[PDB]
Amino acid sequence: AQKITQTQPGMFVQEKEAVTLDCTYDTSDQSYGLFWYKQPSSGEMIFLIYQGSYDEQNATEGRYSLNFQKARKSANLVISASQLGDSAMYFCAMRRNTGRRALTFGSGTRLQVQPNIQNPDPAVYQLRDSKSSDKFVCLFTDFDSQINVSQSKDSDVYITDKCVLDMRSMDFKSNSAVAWSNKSDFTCANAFNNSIIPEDTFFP
Amino acid sequence: TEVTQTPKHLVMGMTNKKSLKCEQHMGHRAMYWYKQKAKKPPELMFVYSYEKLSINESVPSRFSPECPNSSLLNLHLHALQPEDSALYLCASSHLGLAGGIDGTDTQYFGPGTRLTVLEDLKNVFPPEVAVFEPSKAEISRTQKATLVCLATGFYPPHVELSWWVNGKEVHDGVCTDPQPLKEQPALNDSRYALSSRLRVSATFWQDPRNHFRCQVQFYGLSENDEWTQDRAKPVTQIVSAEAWGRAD
Ligand SMILES: *[C@@H]1O[C@H](CO)[C@@H](O)[C@H](O)[C@H]1NC(C)=O
Ligand SMILES: *[C@@H]1O[C@H](CO)[C@@H](O)[C@H](O)[C@H]1NC(C)=O
């Protein structure tokens, strides 16, 4: 039988840097092939690279290369010169070469490419509903790509993930994340109160 | 040079009969069905070699696959169960004859059928949309304005959000949550929320003849279905929220 292991569930790379996604495998059959596929938010499975078990020519295809070490049973993916479109779920996969060639898939590793924040201005702004003026949301924006945004321990406060925004008109990029909640105690000052925020973060 | 699959979304109950279609025109003679549950890897269901079933990974009988032509693999569905909710992925690859060449018979995948199967159709709700205007503080400090659109209360969680400015869909300066977010994370049948951001210059938001619309295409019941409530039947629909740029 065939087994795929992807230890890392999630990775980060800065834009234009290279990253390595890890994969090891087990197989009884001595003739096999290793695949990487990418799954964007859209949901399609895109072929990236292939390495047959007897190649002895480490595989390369565009910005993708494959650290294939049979003795260690490792088939890591190296992605060069990371682009913001590279963010997706990356799947390690394997088939026997001898039968119907059905793929077995690893658990997958999510990759999030981060922009190099030209000039940080960490702020938390408050945004008003265009219909009823009382309801609102809180927007944490413009911070450095290091900062992690954490879910609220509370389950009635909804906190978004990091989102990367590119205004090609401005040649400008920014991170943001959104927080909202219907409890009467919820405001922008406490919205991200259990995420590690830069001290100079602006709260107008 | 691609695999097509229809429908792209499907909501069924435990009585409906439906069929997924898979089509390719590369000449491939190996065709495959895989099932991908949420946060899980895709798992083989069926393999077809030269239009004849080669592999059946103990797939229960209520899945009834079929290959009418070399270019076309169907999957017929009836009497499904809620655990059948998944992304059904079609693939295809070259298959050369015996003693023929041994190439990289790479599998190419369709975009997949997103399938939700409900115990009861009561569970399906359409999104509510709202749009939130950029703050004076942000405009004054960045000379930029970030609108936020927020879709809430919907189920199943497959919606398609886009921003329309002065009638024409925009893509630049947009950020949409890659994945929705559970509103009652402790419940089996949680309803969902999704947020998007559109960022523009301060002048553009301050131009009061500029229109901003956030559009949410929801995938729910079709017309053949049978609604049993005074609530409105949640058909595949578009729900929208709008805002005018203001002088502040
Ligand atoms: C693939 O890369 C590894 C480095 O991790 C190297 O040791 C190995 O020799 C390469 N494979 C081949 C066939 O050269
Ligand atoms: C696949 O296998 C299951 C279990 O053996 C069987 O019940 C089912 O009818 C089979 N399906 C087909 C299409 O052969």
Numbering used by the authors:
A (entry chain A): 1 to 30, 36 to 59, 62 to 68, 74 to 110, 112 to 217
B (entry chain B): 2 to 29, 37 to 58, 63 to 72, 74 to 81, 83 to 111, 111A, 111B, 112C, ...
Please, what does the article write about this entry?
A cryo-electron microscopy study of CD1b-TMM-TCR complexes revealed unique antigen recognition by conserved features of TCRs, positively charged CDR3α, and long CDR3β regions.
A striking characteristic of Y-50 TCRα is the presence of 4 positively charged arginine residues (R107, R108, R113, and R114) within the CDR3α region. Compared with the average CDR3β (14.4 residues), the Y-50 CDR3β was much longer and encoded by 20 residues. The cationic and long loop motifs suggested a TCR binding mechanism controlled by electrostatic interactions and a flexible TCR surface. To gain structural insight into the Y-50 TCR, a soluble TCRαβ was constructed for crystallization. Three CDR3α arginine residues that were found to be critical for TMM recognition were facing toward the TCRβ, whereas R108, which was dispensable, was oriented away from the TCRα-β interface. The electron density of the TCRαβ was clear except for the CDR3β loop region, implying that the extra-long CDR3β loop may be highly flexible, as hypothesized. The positions of backbone Cα atoms in both structures largely overlapped; however, the location of the long CDR3β region was noticeably shifted upon TMM-CD1b contact. Whereas the CDR3β loop hung “downward” in the structure without antigen, it was “drawn up” like a curtain to allow the recognition of TMM presented by CD1b, providing detailed insight into how the long CDR3β creates the flexible TCR interface with the CD1b-TMM complex by avoiding steric hindrance.
